[PDB]
Scaffold this motif. Sequence first.
Motif, PDB file in Angstrom:
ATOM      1  N   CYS A   1      -1.897  -2.172   3.146  1.00 23.88           N
ATOM      2  CA  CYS A   1      -1.808  -2.699   1.813  1.00 23.88           C
ATOM      3  C   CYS A   1      -2.486  -4.032   1.695  1.00 23.88           C
ATOM      4  CB  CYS A   1      -0.349  -2.813   1.342  1.00 23.88           C
ATOM      5  SG  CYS A   1       0.455  -1.203   1.196  1.00 23.88           S
ATOM      6  N   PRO A   2      -3.044  -4.347   0.520  1.00 25.29           N
ATOM      7  CA  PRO A   2      -3.809  -5.575   0.374  1.00 25.29           C
ATOM      8  C   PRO A   2      -2.988  -6.846   0.353  1.00 25.29           C
ATOM      9  CG  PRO A   2      -3.574  -4.453  -1.737  1.00 25.29           C
ATOM     10  CD  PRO A   2      -3.048  -3.511  -0.701  1.00 25.29           C
ATOM     11  N   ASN A   3      -1.734  -6.735   0.028  1.00 22.77           N
ATOM     12  CA  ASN A   3      -0.851  -7.881  -0.185  1.00 22.77           C
ATOM     13  C   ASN A   3       0.547  -7.350  -0.248  1.00 22.77           C
ATOM     14  OD1 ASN A   3      -0.642  -6.977  -2.949  1.00 22.77           O
ATOM     15  ND2 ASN A   3      -2.636  -7.922  -3.166  1.00 22.77           N
ATOM     16  N   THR A   4       1.523  -8.259  -0.214  1.00 21.91           N
ATOM     17  CA  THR A   4       2.913  -7.846  -0.145  1.00 21.91           C
ATOM     18  C   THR A   4       3.335  -7.188  -1.439  1.00 21.91           C
ATOM     19  OG1 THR A   4       3.800  -9.949  -0.763  1.00 21.91           O
ATOM     20  CG2 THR A   4       3.451  -9.507   1.609  1.00 21.91           C
ATOM     21  N   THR A   5       2.767  -7.543  -2.587  1.00 21.77           N
ATOM     22  CA  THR A   5       3.154  -6.810  -3.804  1.00 21.77           C
ATOM     23  C   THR A   5       2.690  -5.363  -3.692  1.00 21.77           C
ATOM     24  OG1 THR A   5       3.223  -8.731  -5.278  1.00 21.77           O
ATOM     25  CG2 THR A   5       2.957  -6.608  -6.307  1.00 21.77           C
ATOM     26  N   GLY A   6       1.508  -5.138  -3.112  1.00 20.32           N
ATOM     27  CA  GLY A   6       1.033  -3.771  -2.950  1.00 20.32           C
ATOM     28  C   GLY A   6       1.949  -3.006  -2.029  1.00 20.32           C
ATOM     29  N   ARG A   7       2.378  -3.640  -0.944  1.00 22.47           N
ATOM     30  CA  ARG A   7       3.360  -3.038  -0.063  1.00 22.47           C
ATOM     31  C   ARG A   7       4.622  -2.664  -0.819  1.00 22.47           C
ATOM     32  NH1 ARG A   7       3.585   0.212   3.329  1.00 22.47           N
ATOM     33  NH2 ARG A   7       1.923  -0.865   4.428  1.00 22.47           N
ATOM     34  N   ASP A   8       5.130  -3.602  -1.612  1.00 20.74           N
ATOM     35  CA  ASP A   8       6.361  -3.312  -2.360  1.00 20.74           C
ATOM     36  C   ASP A   8       6.210  -2.172  -3.288  1.00 20.74           C
ATOM     37  OD1 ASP A   8       7.321  -6.874  -2.663  1.00 20.74           O
ATOM     38  OD2 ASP A   8       7.385  -5.536  -0.894  1.00 20.74           O
ATOM     39  N   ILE A   9       5.076  -2.088  -3.977  1.00 20.45           N
ATOM     40  CA  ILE A   9       4.861  -0.960  -4.853  1.00 20.45           C
ATOM     41  C   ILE A   9       4.779   0.344  -4.096  1.00 20.45           C
ATOM     42  CG2 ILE A   9       3.181   0.131  -6.354  1.00 20.45           C
ATOM     43  CD1 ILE A   9       2.401  -2.921  -7.116  1.00 20.45           C
TER      44      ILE A   9
ATOM     45  N   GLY B   1      -2.633   0.458  -4.720  1.00 18.24           N
ATOM     46  CA  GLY B   1      -3.842  -0.176  -4.186  1.00 18.24           C
ATOM     47  C   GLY B   1      -3.908  -0.188  -2.702  1.00 18.24           C
ATOM     48  N   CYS B   2      -3.019   0.385  -2.005  1.00 17.64           N
ATOM     49  CA  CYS B   2      -2.964   0.548  -0.588  1.00 17.64           C
ATOM     50  C   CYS B   2      -3.919   1.665  -0.183  1.00 17.64           C
ATOM     51  CB  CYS B   2      -1.579   0.770   0.002  1.00 17.64           C
ATOM     52  SG  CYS B   2      -0.344  -0.465  -0.529  1.00 17.64           S
ATOM     53  N   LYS B   3      -4.306   1.621   1.070  1.00 19.08           N
ATOM     54  CA  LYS B   3      -5.139   2.669   1.647  1.00 19.08           C
ATOM     55  C   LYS B   3      -4.333   3.438   2.680  1.00 19.08           C
ATOM     56  CE  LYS B   3      -9.445   0.197   1.067  1.00 19.08           C
ATOM     57  NZ  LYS B   3      -9.946   1.198   0.083  1.00 19.08           N
TER      58      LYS B   3
ATOM     59  N   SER C   1      -3.947   3.729  13.595  1.00 21.91           N
ATOM     60  CA  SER C   1      -2.908   2.754  13.703  1.00 21.91           C
ATOM     61  C   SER C   1      -3.348   1.347  13.313  1.00 21.91           C
ATOM     62  CB  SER C   1      -2.280   2.853  15.098  1.00 21.91           C
ATOM     63  OG  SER C   1      -3.020   2.611  16.199  1.00 21.91           O
ATOM     64  N   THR C   2      -4.634   1.031  13.288  1.00 20.78           N
ATOM     65  CA  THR C   2      -5.013  -0.340  13.015  1.00 20.78           C
ATOM     66  C   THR C   2      -5.499  -0.465  11.590  1.00 20.78           C
ATOM     67  OG1 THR C   2      -5.554  -0.561  15.326  1.00 20.78           O
ATOM     68  CG2 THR C   2      -6.348  -2.260  13.834  1.00 20.78           C
ATOM     69  N   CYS C   3      -4.769  -1.227  10.786  1.00 23.21           N
ATOM     70  CA  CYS C   3      -5.280  -1.526   9.459  1.00 23.21           C
ATOM     71  C   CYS C   3      -6.477  -2.457   9.458  1.00 23.21           C
ATOM     72  CB  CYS C   3      -4.212  -2.160   8.545  1.00 23.21           C
ATOM     73  SG  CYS C   3      -2.878  -1.009   8.180  1.00 23.21           S
ATOM     74  N   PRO C   4      -7.374  -2.332   8.553  1.00 16.39           N
ATOM     75  CA  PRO C   4      -8.442  -3.366   8.460  1.00 16.39           C
ATOM     76  C   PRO C   4      -7.844  -4.698   8.011  1.00 16.39           C
ATOM     77  CG  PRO C   4      -8.590  -1.866   6.637  1.00 16.39           C
ATOM     78  CD  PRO C   4      -7.522  -1.325   7.501  1.00 16.39           C
ATOM     79  N   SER C   5      -8.502  -5.804   8.332  1.00 21.36           N
ATOM     80  CA  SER C   5      -7.973  -7.145   8.041  1.00 21.36           C
ATOM     81  C   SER C   5      -7.818  -7.356   6.545  1.00 21.36           C
ATOM     82  CB  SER C   5      -8.858  -8.209   8.708  1.00 21.36           C
ATOM     83  OG  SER C   5     -10.168  -8.152   8.173  1.00 21.36           O
ATOM     84  N   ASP C   6      -8.588  -6.626   5.740  1.00 22.00           N
ATOM     85  CA  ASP C   6      -8.425  -6.863   4.322  1.00 22.00           C
ATOM     86  C   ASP C   6      -7.257  -6.085   3.724  1.00 22.00           C
ATOM     87  OD1 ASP C   6     -10.015  -4.482   4.947  1.00 22.00           O
ATOM     88  OD2 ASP C   6     -11.226  -4.721   3.187  1.00 22.00           O
ATOM     89  N   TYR C   7      -6.639  -5.220   4.523  1.00 22.45           N
ATOM     90  CA  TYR C   7      -5.427  -4.467   4.060  1.00 22.45           C
ATOM     91  C   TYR C   7      -4.344  -4.558   5.112  1.00 22.45           C
ATOM     92  CZ  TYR C   7      -8.053  -2.660   0.198  1.00 22.45           C
ATOM     93  OH  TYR C   7      -8.817  -2.549  -0.934  1.00 22.45           O
ATOM     94  N   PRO C   8      -3.861  -5.786   5.367  1.00 24.29           N
ATOM     95  CA  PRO C   8      -3.008  -6.020   6.518  1.00 24.29           C
ATOM     96  C   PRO C   8      -1.503  -5.939   6.247  1.00 24.29           C
ATOM     97  CG  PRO C   8      -3.453  -8.060   5.447  1.00 24.29           C
ATOM     98  CD  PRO C   8      -4.168  -7.032   4.639  1.00 24.29           C
ATOM     99  N   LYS C   9      -1.118  -5.627   5.019  1.00 25.37           N
ATOM    100  CA  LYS C   9       0.308  -5.689   4.709  1.00 25.37           C
ATOM    101  C   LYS C   9       0.953  -4.328   4.631  1.00 25.37           C
ATOM    102  CE  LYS C   9       0.071 -10.174   4.378  1.00 25.37           C
ATOM    103  NZ  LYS C   9       0.747 -11.139   5.274  1.00 25.37           N
TER     104      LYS C   9
END
Lengths: 46, 46
Positions: free
Chosen positions: B4-12, B31-33, B38-46
């Motif tokens: 996820c891009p950010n913690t709000t994206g994670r929450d959603i 907006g999450c991928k 197992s490894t998220c890209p740095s731009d989607y670290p949440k």
Amino acid sequence: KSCCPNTTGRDIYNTCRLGGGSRERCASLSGCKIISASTCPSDYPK
Amino acid sequence: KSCCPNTTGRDIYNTCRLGGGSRERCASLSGCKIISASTCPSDYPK
């Protein structure tokens, strides 16, 4: 009427609806409630 | 894995999963991928 606990819930619900989702499914996906009154209660105000 | 891009994206995303949504459906709302590794890209670290 959909009533949501907070703005993020509203945004999820609305986005699910914009995409074509059913009210009850979108409520489940968002944390929102479907109620029978046209005004939302203060604890699901959004 | 969901990334996820950010913690709000994670929450959603997680709210949607809690409501029974598929990974793909919840990714679209958040907006999450969905990455099948197992490894998220740095731009989607949440």
